């Protein structure tokens, strides 16, 4: 290599640490009010509540309900906060523990026969937890009625609310309750002295579309605290990148949330939560020239 100046590579200082910035969690889906409610719908007219426009929560499994029998069927329970989904439906009701086995796709029983069923392409989380301290009435509660006498069978996502008297053997009933003609509704024992399989068990089902509509629902966004005067690998809500963040004077208008240059290169940002104006100064990008005699 004879005498002369050359070029080899780039002095690319390695980003020293990662920082994510997001606005704090102002809204929430009040799952306590979805769990710690006083009453819950009968297994016949189950509650098909709409959960939307709120931030989901997956704090811990054994919550107030303790998540006795929990299973996220077609989605990952781990990344629930990370996974972004919309159009949530909470199908909740009360059954027997022995009936808990009637949740999985295609599971049969009196619930799927006349009360409630769920599909075979399921993408939600079913949690049936022992309601032995909530629904257990010391004298037994029978107000959770179940239909058991009806000619046809019900399919998922279908809620029945009528009381059409059952006709057995095609014997005409003029509203008469007798031999081979019963009232379709019946009542559950649900006593505290019952067995574990006979304990009252409440079921909450969280089923959502996979980004069909605009994503009103989404998970929380942890926000690590920023650190300035280092080549941070920053990932703010709008964009990601690498740079050194510095306090500045740019008066970002209250609605304005980004700042750029003539050549559309984002350099000025506003803190997500608080009102801080950061300039993203570059990191070292100088070619590592080499001087030498031959």
């Amino acid at each position: 290599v004879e005498k002369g100046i050359y070029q080899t590579s780039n002095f690319r200082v390695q980003p020293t640490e990662s920082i994510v910035r997001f606005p704090n969690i102002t809204n929430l889906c009040p799952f306590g009010e979805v769990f710690n409610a006083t009453r819950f719908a009968s297994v016949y007219a189950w509650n098909r509540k709409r959960i939307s426009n709120c931030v989901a929560d997956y704090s811990v499994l054994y919550n107030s309900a303790s998540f006795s029998t929990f299973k996220c069927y077609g989605v990952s329970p781990t990344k629930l906060n990370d996974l972004c989904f919309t159009n949530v439906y909470a199908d909740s009701f009360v059954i027997r523990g022995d009936e808990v086995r009637q949740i999985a796709p295609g599971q049969t029983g009196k619930i799927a026969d006349y009360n409630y069923k769920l599909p075979d392409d399921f993408t939600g989380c079913v949690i049936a937890w022992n309601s032995n301290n909530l629904d257990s009435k010391v004298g037994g509660n029978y107000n959770y009625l179940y239909r058991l006498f009806r000619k046809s069978n019900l399919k998922p996502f279908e809620r029945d609310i009528s009381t059409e008297i059952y006709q057995a053997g095609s014997t005409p009933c003029n509203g008469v309750e007798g031999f081979n003609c019963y009232f379709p509704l019946q009542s559950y024992g649900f006593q505290p002295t019952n067995g574990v399989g006979y304990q009252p068990y409440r079921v909450v089902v969280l089923s959502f579309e996979l980004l069909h509509a605009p994503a009103t629902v989404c998970g929380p966004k942890k926000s690590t605290n920023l650190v300035k005067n280092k080549c941070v690998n920053f990932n703010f809500n709008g964009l990601t990148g690498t740079g050194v963040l510095t306090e500045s004077n740019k008066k970002f208008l209250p609605f304005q949330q980004f700042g750029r240059d003539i050549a559309d290169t984002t350099d000025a940002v506003r803190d997500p939560q608080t009102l801080e104006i950061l300039d993203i100064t570059p990191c070292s990008f100088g070619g590592v020239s080499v001087i030498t005699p031959g």
Binding site: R50, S52, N53, A213, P214, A215, T216, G238, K250, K251, F252, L253, F255, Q256, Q257, F258, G259, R260, D261, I262, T266, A268
Partner: protein
């Protein structure tokens, strides 16, 4: 009728900031000097001058501009929806008392979905009495309500001074609503002034909308003889409507970042000149 909007329909689509430069961007702006429909919120009480009941259904083709020269604070809300029915989900906006109660509640939109304000005796001030707007199946998949409860009527019969401008535009269901609050002085028409339209909220309810109407009040005090829709003599505001169109425009920011003046690219020869050259001069 038809009027010439001098320069209205400028706003910040991007949250970004550019100081003392220009930027040619394409978005559903309102074309300049276009035909603007003037609607008359006036209660001509002549025996041969009809009560100007200017409240028809207006097309929400692409994006609806809205200027409202209101010192009477009678014009409050906007009626949205495709079918404007309870079968197809729809959007509706109101303003009870400085509180927007926008909802996807697909209430019945029969010919009297309006407010009514009456000067009461129990309190010597006009108090909201009529709520005849809604009666239908709620089934509301969305409800955003900010609740600051105030009133700033400030009714003046002589000179228009409070002009509120709003632009409603849909993009992948992120229904964005931009606003501007301007103390004005001109009574004749829109003043030849430049004013941007900062965003207020992008409600992500995502309903396909094709129709658009407006909301006001229709009741009056007791001194007027008669009833609400029979006798009304305090509607003293006016407003104007235009339709955004897909165009490439140019904005000249200042150091502060406020849009000082805009330039159409497809207006005129000098306009196209200033556009393609990327220069305000």
């Amino acid at each position: 009728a038809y009027t010439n909007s001098f320069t209205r329909g400028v706003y910040y689509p991007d949250k970004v900031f550019r100081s003392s430069v220009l930027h040619s961007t394409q978005d559903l702006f309102l074309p300049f000097f276009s035909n603007v429909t003037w609607f008359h919120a006036i209660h001509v009480s002549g025996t041969n001058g009809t009560k100007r009941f200017d409240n028809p259904v207006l097309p929400f083709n692409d994006g609806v501009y809205f200027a409202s020269t209101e010192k009477s604070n009678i014009i409050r809300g906007w009626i949205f929806g495709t079918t404007l029915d309870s079968k197809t989900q729809s959007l509706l906006i109101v303003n009870n008392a400085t509180n927007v109660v926008i909802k996807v509640c697909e209430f019945q939109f029969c010919n009297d979905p309006f407010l009514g304000v009456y000067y009461h005796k129990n309190n010597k001030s006009w108090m909201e009495s009529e709520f005849r707007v809604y009666s239908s199946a709620n089934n509301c998949t969305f409800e955003y309500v900010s609740q600051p409860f105030l009133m700033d009527l400030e009714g003046k019969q002589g000179n228009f001074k409070n002009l509120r401008e709003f632009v409603f535009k849909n993009i992948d269901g992120y229904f964005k609503i931009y606003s501007k609050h301007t103390p004005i002085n001109l009574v004749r028409d829109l003043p030849q002034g430049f004013s941007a339209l900062e965003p207020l909220v992008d409600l992500p309810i995502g309903i396909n909308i094709t129709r658009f109407q407006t909301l006001l009040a229709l009741h009056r005090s007791y001194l007027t003889p008669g009833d609400s829709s029979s006798g009304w003599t305090a509607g003293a505001a006016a407003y104007y409507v235009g339709y955004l169109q897909p165009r490439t425009f140019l904005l000249k920011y200042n150091e502060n970042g406020t849009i000082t003046d805009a330039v159409d690219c497809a207006l005129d020869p000098l306009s196209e000149t200033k556009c393609t050259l990327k220069s305000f001069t």
